[PDB]
Design a protein around this ligand. Structure first.
Ligand SMILES: *[C@@H]1O[C@H](CO[C@@H]2O[C@@H](C)[C@@H](O)[C@@H](O)[C@@H]2O)[C@@H](O[C@@H]2O[C@H](CO)[C@@H](O[C@@H]3O[C@H](CO[C@H]4O[C@H](CO)[C@@H](O)[C@H](O)[C@@H]4O)[C@@H](O)[C@H](O)[C@@H]3O)[C@H](O)[C@H]2NC(C)=O)[C@H](O)[C@H]1NC(C)=O
Ligand SMILES: *[C@@H]1O[C@H](CO[C@@H]2O[C@@H](C)[C@@H](O)[C@@H](O)[C@@H]2O)[C@@H](O[C@@H]2O[C@H](CO)[C@@H](O[C@@H]3O[C@H](CO[C@H]4O[C@H](CO)[C@@H](O)[C@H](O)[C@@H]4O)[C@@H](O)[C@H](O)[C@@H]3O)[C@H](O)[C@H]2NC(C)=O)[C@H](O)[C@H]1NC(C)=O
Ligand SMILES: *[C@@H]1O[C@H](CO[C@@H]2O[C@@H](C)[C@@H](O)[C@@H](O)[C@@H]2O)[C@@H](O[C@@H]2O[C@H](CO)[C@@H](O[C@@H]3O[C@H](CO)[C@@H](O)[C@H](O)[C@@H]3O)[C@H](O)[C@H]2NC(C)=O)[C@H](O)[C@H]1NC(C)=O
Ligand SMILES: *[C@@H]1O[C@H](CO[C@@H]2O[C@@H](C)[C@@H](O)[C@@H](O)[C@@H]2O)[C@@H](O[C@@H]2O[C@H](CO)[C@@H](O[C@@H]3O[C@H](CO)[C@@H](O)[C@H](O)[C@@H]3O)[C@H](O)[C@H]2NC(C)=O)[C@H](O)[C@H]1NC(C)=O
Ligand SMILES: *[C@@H]1O[C@H](CO)[C@@H](O[C@@H]2O[C@H](CO)[C@@H](O[C@@H]3O[C@H](CO)[C@@H](O)[C@H](O)[C@@H]3O)[C@H](O)[C@H]2NC(C)=O)[C@H](O)[C@H]1NC(C)=O
Ligand SMILES: *[C@@H]1O[C@H](CO)[C@@H](O[C@@H]2O[C@H](CO)[C@@H](O[C@@H]3O[C@H](CO)[C@@H](O)[C@H](O)[C@@H]3O)[C@H](O)[C@H]2NC(C)=O)[C@H](O)[C@H]1NC(C)=O
Ligand SMILES: *[C@@H]1O[C@H](CO[C@@H]2O[C@@H](C)[C@@H](O)[C@@H](O)[C@@H]2O)[C@@H](O[C@@H]2O[C@H](CO)[C@@H](O)[C@H](O)[C@H]2NC(C)=O)[C@H](O)[C@H]1NC(C)=O
Ligand SMILES: *[C@@H]1O[C@H](CO[C@@H]2O[C@@H](C)[C@@H](O)[C@@H](O)[C@@H]2O)[C@@H](O[C@@H]2O[C@H](CO)[C@@H](O)[C@H](O)[C@H]2NC(C)=O)[C@H](O)[C@H]1NC(C)=O
Ligand SMILES: *[C@@H]1O[C@H](CO)[C@@H](O[C@@H]2O[C@H](CO)[C@@H](O)[C@H](O)[C@H]2NC(C)=O)[C@H](O)[C@H]1NC(C)=O
Ligand SMILES: *[C@@H]1O[C@H](CO)[C@@H](O[C@@H]2O[C@H](CO)[C@@H](O)[C@H](O)[C@H]2NC(C)=O)[C@H](O)[C@H]1NC(C)=O
Ligand SMILES: CCCCC/C=C\C/C=C\CCCCCCCC(=O)O
Ligand SMILES: CC(=O)N[C@@H]1[C@@H](O)[C@H](O)[C@@H](CO)O[C@H]1O
Ligand SMILES: *[C@@H]1O[C@H](CO)[C@@H](O)[C@H](O)[C@H]1NC(C)=O
Lengths: 289, 48, 241, 48
């Protein structure tokens, strides 16, 4: 027996502030890649269309989610990583890459979930005489693990023993970018922001722009809870979730329980179709009843 | 007779429990896949 | 003192051997489940594993540098709040970044910096007055990248007599630039051992430090009767891999 | 890695092997082909 939904329910958390797009993408100063910086994002609305009037990105790529779904989701643990690299090095900020940047400065995990954005900043980061304030590491003993930082400055020796700079076979491990106004595109400065998050597994405080509706219970409806969409019937539940739990699953891995993001009440979710049906006929050429 | 009954019940319950297998997809939950991915990308996982 | 200090005469530590017993289980994810069995592979403490025990009593003050390997289970049996926190790092000096996680009797403080760590970090408590006097964890700090301070509270620092009453259990993991910390608590009335039993731990911290962790050290409390004299009180803690 | 101090590549793509495994392997019959093209034609040096 088949039942079709007759309602729509959208429940998102109470959020009023816009996400700090200006403070992140329009900051006055950016760090060096070897000392990349991490910031936490929470309790804001991710309405990125506001950037359409002021910003333009040469690189934008997402992993683990489709770019056309971003407006309908909520994001759990949102971090933004900022740094500056060379034009030729932007290709190295991606899973499964090799090179100096990917090996010794900044690495992404194999199962990365998030987005990478990069844009050219020759006007503000390059000078006619040359800007040398940005640096990167080019000598190290072993490669970096994902999302690992190394800001030490110790003389490097291939033998891997303590050293003194002026001595032979002794090198300072950091090197300077040289950014000139007349450089080719491959040697121009680029600002890079990497956003990382998790989806549909835990509480979230960062959500896209969507109108939240009222709760309909004891009825077959379409529902969207913090970006998880489905069809079913919602009923009050006797389960008791922990503060760090948002969803509940049964033995078949079907999401069967959910906490309401606005009232915090637990609700059970049940399918709409249920029941066996049989048809008895005397034969079509005898009758159509 | 008890063995017959138990065998039938176990077969049905195993069928129900096998719904949590990934089968090489990113997830075994259809709703999660249809909430994260667009049609073209979701089709591959759903086919698996 | 206001600078790093080393206790004059301290007995060398001979680490004791014990076994865990169905200890160190934690919630693997954030999904709710009930009345079921769930099979999962993860970094766990195998049942009946060998664990190493360190103690503070008389002139014994055990706080060496212990390797981290792939994460640890850390248990503390105490009655007067002797163990106060940890320092995690790689070189344990100012040549690399380290993270300090402490409870200083008023707040919980987590700080990642280039610390000039003292080889003998401790809190100071006066035996007669029974109040916290000095903090001597580090001498200098710079290039700080992460900081967290909790809401204020009050902690009973005074010494106590009797049997160990509190067992506090922690699990520490390091993965993809995150330090995972799980916590659990249990009342006890043991004399001297690691109690046997079962108790699940809950997630309390996922710190985005992005540092390399290969060594760690415990932060203890010294009950000095007066200046130039140091006292230890009684407490124990155990480590497993 | 000796190239990290002197050279910079605008295009680098590998087929049949992962870039992160290169340091662990040995290679059987190694040939290098060199030539010069226009900037717009670099995209044409790829299978298919
Ligand atoms: C999207 O952004 C545009 C452009 O914003 C401006 O330019 C960018 C680069 C930044 O510097 C911003 O700070 C600037 O505001 C916005 O349109 C502008 O809006 C402002 C504020 O209302 C307008 O400024 C007023 O415009 C009137 C006079 O305009 C006349 O003269 C100007 C030359 O000065 C000429 O460009 C314009 O066509 C008119 O002929 C008047 O009320 C007052 O004096 C003041 O100057 C400004 O004119 C707008 N510019 C344009 C090109 O329309 C949008 O508001 C913004 N959109 C959203 C949705 O936020
Ligand atoms: C990686 O490559 C760098 C740079 O190599 C130099 O530049 C490139 C473009 C080529 O032209 C190379 O041939 C050049 O050598 C190497 O660092 C350089 O090493 C050389 C050799 O030891 C250094 O030359 C000596 O440096 C001393 C004086 O330096 C002082 O003055 C210079 C003025 O330019 C200044 O840059 C520097 O900071 C000092 O103030 C002295 O012993 C002697 O006279 C001689 O000049 C040179 O200084 C180094 N350059 C830099 C920028 O550090 C690395 O050795 C190489 N690494 C590895 C691992 O091979
Ligand atoms: C980092 O910290 C060290 C001190 O740390 C100690 O030594 C390390 C090598 C490790 O073994 C650590 O575990 C250990 O705690 C600082 O070393 C400092 O060096 C300077 C000289 O470069 C010393 O200056 C001298 O200090 C005394 C002052 O009375 C006199 O000998 C001299 O007059 C002179 O001033 C300084 O004492 C020394 N500090 C010590 C030994 O504790 C190092 O400077 C520091 N680095 C940074 C960047 O802060
Ligand atoms: C437990 O630790 C807290 C937190 O203090 C932090 O950790 C300490 C170990 C030191 O490194 C502190 O610098 C660090 O902030 C202590 O409470 C905090 O104490 C600090 C001073 O140490 C207070 O900051 C000062 O406050 C006023 C201005 O507001 C001025 O005196 C100074 O300019 C300075 O800013 C701080 O407000 C206070 N609380 C918080 C929430 O930061 C606490 O005293 C300590 N307890 C014990 C028993 O040691
Ligand atoms: C980690 O800490 C170290 C040590 O404090 C920092 O290095 C120090 O950085 C300062 C600021 O750039 C340097 O001072 C500057 O040096 C030159 C002149 O010598 C010039 O740029 C400025 O006028 C200013 O004086 C300082 O020399 C340097 N110290 C050492 C020993 O190298 C380092 O920046 C910190 N790292 C991070 C990632 O924050
Ligand atoms: C429980 O017992 C096991 C052995 O049954 C202990 O593991 C052993 O720990 C020692 C000391 O760390 C290891 O030796 C050291 O290992 C590395 C090189 O592998 C390095 O630090 C030193 O050079 C030294 O060789 C030893 O390999 C290791 N054995 C095994 C089989 O893992 C374990 O530490 C004990 N548990 C506790 C909590 O102490
Ligand atoms: C999230 O917000 C809801 C709705 O708040 C009300 O409506 C908003 C549009 C705005 O006008 C608010 O000021 C209103 O209060 C909260 O639901 C209310 O909760 C209060 C708690 O005292 C209760 O008295 C009201 O009856 C609730 N309103 C409705 C319509 O049910 C909800 O508490 C907020 N959740 C969190 C976690 O803050
Ligand atoms: C690539 O070679 C050029 C020059 O070509 C020859 O090879 C050099 C290694 C060196 O022997 C040159 O004299 C040869 O002509 C190098 O560029 C020049 O290198 C010389 C070295 O003596 C130096 O004096 C010049 O200043 C360099 N000129 C420029 C414009 O950089 C270049 O360094 C070689 N690249 C590498 C990675 O070794
Ligand atoms: C980023 O912030 C800077 C600094 O506020 C903005 O630069 C201003 O640009 C306007 C014209 O658009 C000038 O009149 C101002 O003098 C500039 N500076 C300040 C301090 O007002 C810049 O527009 C911002 N970028 C975006 C995309 O919003
Ligand atoms: C720690 O110090 C205590 C005393 O404070 C020691 O206990 C005494 O030990 C001696 C020597 O064996 C006995 O003769 C006494 O009877 C003990 N006194 C008490 C009150 O028990 C203890 O041995 C020291 N060592 C340890 C490991 O605790
Ligand atoms: C002269 C050619 C030598 C033959 C090479 C042999 C086998 C193939 C394996 C590795 C070649 C690596 C190519 C250079 C990578 C530079 C990476 C960067 O700078 O981003
Ligand atoms: C009412 C009627 O015409 N019924 C016929 C039935 O007699 C026949 O046997 C069958 C085919 O076998 O088709 C139907
Ligand atoms: C070392 O072992 C002895 C017994 O062999 C024990 O009495 C002593 O307490 C141990 N060390 C310390 C520091 O307690």
């Amino acid at each position: 027996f088949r039942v079709v939904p007759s309602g729509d329910v959208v429940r998102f958390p109470n959020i009023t502030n816009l996400c700090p797009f200006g403070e992140v993408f329009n900051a006055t100063k950016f760090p060096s890649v070897y000392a990349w910086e991490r910031k936490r994002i929470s309790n804001c609305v991710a309405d990125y269309s506001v950037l359409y009037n002021s910003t333009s990105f040469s690189t934008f790529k997402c992993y683990g989610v489709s770019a056309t779904k971003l407006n309908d989701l909520c994001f759990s643990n949102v971090y933004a990583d900022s740094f500056v690299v060379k034009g030729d090095d932007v290709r190295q900020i991606a899973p499964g890459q090799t090179g100096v940047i990917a090996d010794y400065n900044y690495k992404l995990p194999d199962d990365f979930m998030g987005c990478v954005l990069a844009w050219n900043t020759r006007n503000i980061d390059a000078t006619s005489t040359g800007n040398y304030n940005y640096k990167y590491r080019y000598l190290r003993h072993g490669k970096l693990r994902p999302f690992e930082r190394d800001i030490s400055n110790v003389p490097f020796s291939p033998d891997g023993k303590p050293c003194t700079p002026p001595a032979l076979n002794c090198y300072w491990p950091l090197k300077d970018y040289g950014f000139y106004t007349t450089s080719g595109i491959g040697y121009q400065p680029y600002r890079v922001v990497v956003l990382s998050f998790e989806l549909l597994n835990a509480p979230a405080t960062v959500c896209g722009p969507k109108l939240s509706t009222d709760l309909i219970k004891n009825q077959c409806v379409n529902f969207n809870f913090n970006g998880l969409t489905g069809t079913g019937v919602l009923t009050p539940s006797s389960k008791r979730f922990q503060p760090f739990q948002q969803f509940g699953r049964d033995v078949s891995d079907f999401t069967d329980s959910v906490r309401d993001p606005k009232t915090s009440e637990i609700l059970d979710i049940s399918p709409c179709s249920f029941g066996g049906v049989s048809v008895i006929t005397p034969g079509t050429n005898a009758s159509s009843e | 007779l008890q063995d017959v009954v138990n065998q039938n019940a176990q077969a049905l319950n195993t069928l129900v429990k096998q719904l949590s297998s990934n089968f090489g997809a990113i997830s075994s939950v259809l709703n999660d896949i249809l909430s994260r991915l667009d049609k073209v990308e979701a089709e591959v996982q759903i086919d698996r | 003192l206001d600078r790093c200090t080393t206790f004059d005469d301290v007995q060398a530590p001979n680490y004791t051997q014990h076994t865990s017993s169905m200890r160190g289980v934690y919630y693997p994810d954030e999904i709710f489940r009930s009345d079921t069995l769930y099979l999962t592979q993860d970094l766990f403490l195998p049942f009946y594993s060998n664990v190493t025990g360190f103690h503070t009593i008389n002139h014994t003050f055990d706080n060496p540098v212990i390797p981290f390997k792939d994460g640890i289970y850390f248990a503390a049996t105490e009655k007067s709040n002797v163990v106060r926190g940890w320092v995690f790092g790689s070189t344990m000096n100012n040549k690399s970044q380290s993270v300090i996680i402490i409870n200083n009797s008023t707040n919980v403080v987590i700080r990642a910096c280039n610390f000039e760590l003292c080889d003998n970090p401790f809190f100071a408590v006066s035996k007669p007055m029974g109040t916290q006097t000095h903090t001597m964890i580090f001498d200098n700090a710079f290039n700080c990248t992460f900081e967290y301070i909790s809401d204020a509270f009050s902690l009973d620092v005074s010494e106590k007599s009797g049997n160990f009453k509190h067992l506090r259990e922690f699990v520490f993991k390091n993965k993809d630039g995150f330090l995972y910390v799980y916590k659990g608590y249990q009342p006890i009335d043991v004399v001297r051992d690691l109690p046997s039993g079962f108790n699940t731990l809950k997630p309390i911290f996922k710190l985005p430090l992005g540092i390399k962790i290969t060594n760690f050290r415990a932060i203890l409390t010294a009950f000095l009767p007066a200046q130039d004299t140091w006292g230890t009180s009684a407490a124990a803690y155990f480590v497993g891999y």
